[PDB]
Amino acid sequence: ANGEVMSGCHWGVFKARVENGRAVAFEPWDKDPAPSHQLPGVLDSIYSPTRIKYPMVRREFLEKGVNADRSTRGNGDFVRVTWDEALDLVARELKRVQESYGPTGTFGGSYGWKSPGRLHNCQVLMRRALNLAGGFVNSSGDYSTAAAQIIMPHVMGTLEVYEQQTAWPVVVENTDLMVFWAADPMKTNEIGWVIPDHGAYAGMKALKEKGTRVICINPVRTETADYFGADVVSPRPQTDVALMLGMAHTLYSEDLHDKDFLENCTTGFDLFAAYLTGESDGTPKTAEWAAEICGLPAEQIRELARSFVAGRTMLAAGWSIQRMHHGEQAHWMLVTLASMIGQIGLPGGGFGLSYHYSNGGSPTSDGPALGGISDGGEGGATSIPCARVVDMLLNPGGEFQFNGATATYPDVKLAYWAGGNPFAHHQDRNRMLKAWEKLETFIVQDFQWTATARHADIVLPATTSYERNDIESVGDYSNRAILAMKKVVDPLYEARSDYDIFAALAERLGKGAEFTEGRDEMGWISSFYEAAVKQAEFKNVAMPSFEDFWSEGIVEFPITEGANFVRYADFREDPLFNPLGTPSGLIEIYSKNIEKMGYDDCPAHPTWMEPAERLGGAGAKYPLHVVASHPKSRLHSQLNGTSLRDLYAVAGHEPCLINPADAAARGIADGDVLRVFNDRGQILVGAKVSDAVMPGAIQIYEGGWYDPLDPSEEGTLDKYGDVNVLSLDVGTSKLAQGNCGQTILADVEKYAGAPVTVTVFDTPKGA
Ligand SMILES: Nc1nc2c(c(=O)[nH]1)N[C@H]1C(S)=C(S)[C@@H](COP(=O)(O)OP(=O)(O)OC[C@H]3O[C@@H](n4cnc5c(=O)[nH]c(N)nc54)[C@H](O)[C@@H]3O)O[C@H]1N2
Ligand SMILES: Nc1nc2c(c(=O)[nH]1)N[C@H]1C(S)=C(S)[C@@H](COP(=O)(O)OP(=O)(O)OC[C@H]3O[C@@H](n4cnc5c(=O)[nH]c(N)nc54)[C@H](O)[C@@H]3O)O[C@H]1N2
Ligand SMILES: OC[C@H]1O[C@@H](O)[C@H](O)[C@@H](O)[C@@H]1O
Ligand SMILES: OC[C@H]1O[C@@H](O)[C@H](O)[C@@H](O)[C@@H]1O
Ligand SMILES: OC[C@H]1O[C@@H](O)[C@H](O)[C@@H](O)[C@@H]1O
Ligand SMILES: [Mo+6]
Ligand SMILES: [O]
Ligand SMILES: [O]
């Protein structure tokens, strides 16, 4: 066809131009306040050299199945097969594992960002089919807030991280000092889990125009600091809890803390104060004590603390600091500091844990909620914390602790992954490669030839959202509209929707009608729309017929009371009438429930503990902290294998931001090929020399595609730059068992070996 088609994605709403059946541009939505620069890469991902054309089976698995040499996964030897051959093999394997081992034999957690959409949700569709086969082992939590989402319920009485924030207009009108703590909102609000509304950009523009003072506490001077002209304060990475303690000690010793707020809204302050002063352990937590750990001058620490109580202050914290050893302590100590400041529940005061994620603070509309397809049970134990996947494979039947409970790891034999990239997202790549040999069968379903697809036994080519129809909400927190995600182009090559793949597997198991319910694509979509219309009718919100909605492509909802929302205002007004969901009904600075667990690595009040490895730590073996943060010009690993890579690759490798003093000490110049290494692994990167990163730290973003020099050699050099070749794979503590992906020390040198060639962005042989 020829014309324009409106649809959406994790980067926003867009208008595609189609010529002779091929999409030629993904243009920004006219109503978007800040369109994404990544749209050209989203378009290219439909057509790039790494688009998966056909079903494939690795040669060793096609010939020997369960008896294959497991060490050769990832060596490139794939055989093209027909869809019938691939689907029959997958169905035979699903049935074999269920009959031999029961539900504990299959792992169906399949963590990953996939694509938005209420119908074409690849993970829910996979679980719908696996439940019809007999069941599976799931995963709990995520890689984003694994620690904060477990400690917050014990402290504030709610998960806190994925909840609406005090509205942006209220912050602009009332806040005197905005503190971005381990957060880069100008970078991270580009993405949404549903289709993003980019509402944070409207709020940040209003904040900039008013001239309000901004401070960001971060090892890197970011686009957020440049936009606002912010003061940048850079503690050594992993020392924020010590900095917060020094600030708290200053407030207490100078009688600047809010005694009334502490008495009326919290429990355990007296016990915490005994720790703060050193009465309980012999070590006063002074600004000088804190300065020695974090590297900032003691007077700067005292001045920051005094400035937080001088006017109305908002502590807007990000999540990198909890994606680390003892991560639970970061936001627990932040809430304790906010309680001493005493402004929780006031307009523009307190703290917020989602101003940097999916446009939190964009005012909530009066529209209805939109539902989608279910798993028939998205957005040994029968479930594991997600980042314990390798520990599980290495210790079948072994015990593990999690948030007060004791359980044993299930004995998993088959793993099915759809819409995720664990060979980019999981920690300690070399350890993971050896552990994966414990799986009998590994099936991967995607549209791009990621490191995960390259390591599979069986590869099934899915379609993108642009090759089918769907329905989804716009604005993770605002719910400003419902959008028709219309088909842009017909399915490419031999690709099939995840729905069509799972329906064909359900048919082979004799459960076809149970999977489909006799509905077709538009039948499912209209059912979801009609349920939203009924909910809206009960709340006096007008909506068009399904036919008129589909023709127009969108329905917008108005904002009224959502513009005035203040988080914790009811609790502050009357804590006895509106108690929190904690044992006391108050903020738990001291937790008796956590005391009873007896976990050495997660005490009963916020506490400073040395991490496994850190910059400035006694016995540290490597010199530089690696800031393994989220990428500017990708969504994780998404879009690495597209023309968008040209915006940032350095000599064909992932970029490494390095301070001029650390570079000059090693004879490194901008543009040089470098080797980054530690005792766990080694990778290549390209140098980007800049004083934006503090001395003692280097920045290498997560998501790079792993490209082994010699796949048959243990510890081989990664030719491209997957930062998770350098990371450690351990739990945050026994409380949350979260990942520690930003706890990394390494050295760097000018590469001195023979020239190598990156091949991970090329079409695999035979594909
Ligand atoms: N373009 C883009 N946007 C995204 C994503 C993406 O991949 N690309 N991913 C999405 C997802 S799933 C999430 S969870 C969010 C990510 O949200 P976050 O986890 O908050 O983001 P990060 O980029 O990992 O880190 C935030 C900031 O913390 C700083 N930092 C790192 N270590 C420390 C430390 O020890 N102390 C202090 N004070 N600061 C530190 C970093 O320099 C960075 O500027 O972004 C979302 N949006
Ligand atoms: N060192 C370090 N490691 C980190 C982090 C960090 O800060 N530091 N960040 C962590 C976090 S919070 C996250 S969320 C993870 C990110 O890990 P992931 O979510 O696994 O990363 P993505 O690259 O988004 O992978 C999603 C995959 O889904 C595929 N896909 C998209 N839509 C569909 C669909 O409809 N069908 C199918 N079959 N496939 C589809 C995409 O092409 C892509 O390959 O990384 C984690 N790892
Ligand atoms: O070529 C015909 C085949 O096309 C595939 O896209 C359909 O999934 C399958 O059901 C059909 O038989
Ligand atoms: O067809 C494209 C148009 O569709 C409308 O429904 C959207 O509100 C408008 O912003 C967009 O330009
Ligand atoms: O010492 C026990 C701890 O050991 C760590 O290696 C594991 O990652 C963690 O799950 C466990 O609680
Ligand atoms: Mo995440
Ligand atoms: O995550
Ligand atoms: O995430």
Swiss-Prot record:
Residue positions binding Mo-bis(molybdopterin guanine dinucleotide): 113-115, 144, 187-188, 217-218, 238-240, 319-320, 323, 421, 425, 445-446, 468, 498, 628-631, 634, 636-638, 724, 741-742
Cofactor note (record): Binds 1 molybdenum-bis(molybdopterin guanine dinucleotide) (Mo-bis-MGD) cofactor per subunit.
Subunit structure: Homodimer.
EC code: 1.7.2.3, 1.8.5.3
Compartments in which it is found: Periplasm
Superkingdom per UniProt: Bacteria
Catalytic activity as recorded in UniProt: dimethyl sulfide + a menaquinone + H2O = dimethyl sulfoxide + a menaquinol; trimethylamine + 2 Fe(III)-[cytochrome c] + H2O = trimethylamine N-oxide + 2 Fe(II)-[cytochrome c] + 3 H(+)
Keyword GTP-binding: no
Known function: Catalyzes the reduction of dimethyl sulfoxide (DMSO) and trimethylamine N-oxide (TMAO) to dimethyl sulfide (DMS) and trimethylamine, respectively. The terminal DMSO reductase can also use various sulfoxides and N-oxide compounds as terminal electron acceptor in addition to DMSO and TMAO.
Listed name of the protein: Dimethyl sulfoxide/trimethylamine N-oxide reductase
Family: Belongs to the prokaryotic molybdopterin-containing oxidoreductase family.
GO cellular component terms, semicolon-separated: outer membrane-bounded periplasmic space
Cofactor: Mo-bis(molybdopterin guanine dinucleotide)
GO molecular function: electron transfer activity; molybdenum ion binding; molybdopterin cofactor binding; trimethylamine-N-oxide reductase (cytochrome c) activity
Annotated organism of origin: Cereibacter sphaeroides
GO biological process, one term: anaerobic respiration
CDD domains: MopB_CT_DMSOR-BSOR-TMAOR, MopB_DMSOR-BSOR-TMAOR
Effect of disrupting the coding gene: Disruption of dmsA results in the inability to use DMSO or TMAO as the terminal electron acceptor in anaerobic respiration and in greatly diminished in vitro DMSOR activity.
PTM entry text: Predicted to be exported by the Tat system. The position of the signal peptide cleavage has been experimentally proven.
UniProt keyword list: Metal-binding, Molybdenum, Oxidoreductase, Periplasm, Signal
Keyword Ribonucleoprotein (UniProt): no
Gene that this sequence comes from: dmsA
Main location (coarse class): periplasm
